[PDB]
Ligand binder design. Structure first.
Ligand SMILES: C[Se][C@@H]1O[C@@H](C)[C@@H](O)[C@@H](O)[C@@H]1O
Ligand SMILES: C[Se][C@@H]1O[C@@H](C)[C@@H](O)[C@@H](O)[C@@H]1O
Ligand SMILES: C[Se][C@@H]1O[C@@H](C)[C@@H](O)[C@@H](O)[C@@H]1O
Ligand SMILES: C[Se][C@@H]1O[C@@H](C)[C@@H](O)[C@@H](O)[C@@H]1O
Ligand SMILES: C[Se][C@@H]1O[C@@H](C)[C@@H](O)[C@@H](O)[C@@H]1O
Ligand SMILES: C[Se][C@@H]1O[C@@H](C)[C@@H](O)[C@@H](O)[C@@H]1O
Ligand SMILES: C[Se][C@@H]1O[C@@H](C)[C@@H](O)[C@@H](O)[C@@H]1O
Ligand SMILES: C[Se][C@@H]1O[C@@H](C)[C@@H](O)[C@@H](O)[C@@H]1O
Ligand SMILES: C[Se][C@@H]1O[C@@H](C)[C@@H](O)[C@@H](O)[C@@H]1O
Ligand SMILES: C[Se][C@@H]1O[C@@H](C)[C@@H](O)[C@@H](O)[C@@H]1O
Lengths: 310, 310
């Protein structure tokens, strides 16, 4: 390993945001502080001078953004209250109002977060697991945090994946949420602007490891078309990918890359499509590694050890 | 899962002590508290009313005992100081003097602990990883905790296995310590009463997962003979066993049982030989399971879900 890599918590939560190939990655260090590494034509930071929040050890991490003008990063306090680190262009980093609402979740809860697409207004939906193991939606729509729709019972400590886009034909955001149920299946809940939340759980994988990491993204949204990618750590100790492609539905499942036992994962994407995965695969023991996909070279490992590791 | 199982921290540290088939198992709950489950012709306890200490989330755990008269359980504070929960017959549980010595270790350090065998006096040796990644020995011999021998550089966050016995022919304890080096090998350091600490690192396994759990025991010590068992989580997501048997040396390596990704492990034994392993394999998601070995039936899974899970 390296002195920098040692600062990164083993099996740390991971989250990432971007505006095309301008990237931010968030993770937890060994003392509980949440750090930010960035990519601006080169990787940097991720040091003790790059802390945006403090959370309990082994906290989940979630993040969403509107380009890089507005960024929100979610974690858990030591009392298992959802808290929010907020960045706004022109104001910098500050404590968000979420913790003020005093939403307590399960100790083993994960978090998902999305800005609602299709509008310039700042609307947020975040998802967590309450003490009754149900996946609760919490919302921001301009004046205060409120509980939203409850998405039903999930496995204790389930991973939570979430993505959001807007069909050109429709006037409102579409939302997809992925988690693991008691039968260890991976399933999808769905919201569309013209239907509201569908009742149907859609299975995307029959049997995954318990509390496996889950993360999802979407690209190339159209009039009534979408392409989605969902990633989870399978029992063979690699990240697996599930593909939704317009005109084919869920039509592919394949391994992507090795990871350490019990690695967390983050996924970002931009039009192209370009994909970036972040995870731990044992590089310098505890460093975060990058996996890439692009039209030019296809599936390629990226940055081997993110800052502060190198 | 079950409400009881949910209280058990995922990938919790695990430690166990015994006097023959009278057993104690220690683990961490989701709020950081260290609990004790027991076996006295039946499993019990492990509830919030059975807390013996409080430690940082994801703390290592180590424990050693002289039968069940004296028990010591070691963990890390949130400042990564070694602390000790102590039980003495007739006095019950109390804070041990270890934390008073203010030994700070690496955030990712593990702990090993042994009472020195062969004497009725209460002598302790405990092993941890300092911030320079060297494995430091700390000792108790009657009046105060002191740093002992340093065993050299190990992998950052290495597991630490340790066992202790007394050869009948010799007048002093023998000690064996196992950890993982930078080349991801598993190795042995050795102390004998007539030689002191040998200089030689002995390899017992060529390549294990980074920071894999490690735990060891011994049985049937003789005049100049010993039998040892070392357990670690391999890359196939099972516990593997390494056997030392008198007249054969290190002569066997085999899988034992499946475990969750990144499970910790504990091992106890008594004359027979009887062996008990404790670990997490996904039973009720987060419960601790038992694996057994005896002369009667050989390799058999034991208690599927320890208290408080059931
Ligand atoms: C053409 Se460099 C490629 O794309 C960048 C946006 C980053 O993901 C970098 O780590 C990767 O190696
Ligand atoms: C314009 Se400052 C730069 O860009 C923002 C998107 C944030 O990630 C901030 O922490 C970083 O220092
Ligand atoms: C302008 Se309030 C600021 O932005 C909102 C979108 C929310 O994230 C809120 O919690 C935060 O405090
Ligand atoms: C206008 Se309904 C409101 O916004 C939607 C996008 C969903 O988050 C729904 O659950 C919530 O109740
Ligand atoms: C047409 Se390749 C297909 O779509 C890409 C965008 C990637 O998700 C790749 O892993 C998948 O196999
Ligand atoms: C003859 Se029961 C057998 O031995 C006991 C000492 C315990 O380890 C128990 O869980 C196991 O099932
Ligand atoms: C004689 Se009390 C019983 O036995 C001791 C060995 C301890 O494990 C204690 O916590 C338990 O309640
Ligand atoms: C009679 Se002091 C008691 O017992 C010793 C063996 C040590 O574990 C010490 O730290 C503890 O406070
Ligand atoms: C009488 Se030397 C003392 O006790 C031995 C058993 C070892 O722990 C050694 O490292 C220590 O320095
Ligand atoms: C003579 Se079986 C041999 O020794 C036993 C005590 C156990 O460790 C078993 O796993 C091993 O295969």
């Amino acid at each position: 390993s390296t002195p920098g890599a040692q600062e990164v918590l083993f099996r740390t939560g991971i989250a990432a945001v971007n505006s095309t190939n301008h990237l931010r990655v968030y993770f937890q260090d060994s003392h509980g502080s949440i750090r930010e590494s960035l990519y601006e034509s080169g990787w940097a930071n991720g040091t003790a001078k790059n802390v945006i929040a403090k959370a309990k050890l082994g906290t989940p991490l979630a993040a969403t953004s509107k380009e890089l003008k507005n960024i929100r990063v979610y974690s858990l306090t030591e009392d298992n209250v959802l808290q929010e680190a907020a960045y706004d262009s022109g104001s910098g980093w500050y404590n968000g109002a979420l913790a003020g609402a005093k939403f307590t979740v399960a100790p083993y809860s994960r978090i998902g977060s999305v800005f609602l697409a299709g509008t310039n207004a700042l609307q947020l939906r975040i998802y967590a697991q309450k003490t009754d193991n149900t996946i609760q939606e919490y919302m921001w729509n301009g004046d205060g945090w409120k509980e939203g729709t409850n998405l039903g019972v999930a496995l204790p400590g389930t991973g939570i994946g979430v993505t959001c886009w807007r069909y050109t034909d429709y006037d409102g955001p579409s939302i997809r949420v992925w988690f693991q149920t008691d039968n260890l299946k991976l399933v999808q809940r769905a919201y569309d602007p013209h239907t509201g939340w569908y009742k149907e759980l859609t299975t995307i994988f029959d049997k995954a490891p318990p509390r496996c990491a889950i993360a999802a993204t979407n690209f190339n949204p159209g009039k009534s078309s979408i392409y989605m990618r969902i990633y989870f750590v399978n029992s063979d100790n690699t990240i697996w990918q599930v593909c939704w492609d317009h005109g084919q539905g869920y039509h592919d499942k394949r391994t992507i890359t090795p990871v350490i036992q019990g690695s967390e994962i983050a996924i970002i994407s931009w039009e192209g499509p370009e994909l970036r995965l972040y995870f731990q695969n044992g590089t310098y023991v505890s460093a975060i590694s990058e996996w890439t996909w692009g039209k030019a070279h296809g599936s390629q490992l990226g940055r081997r050890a993110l800052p502060p590791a190198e």
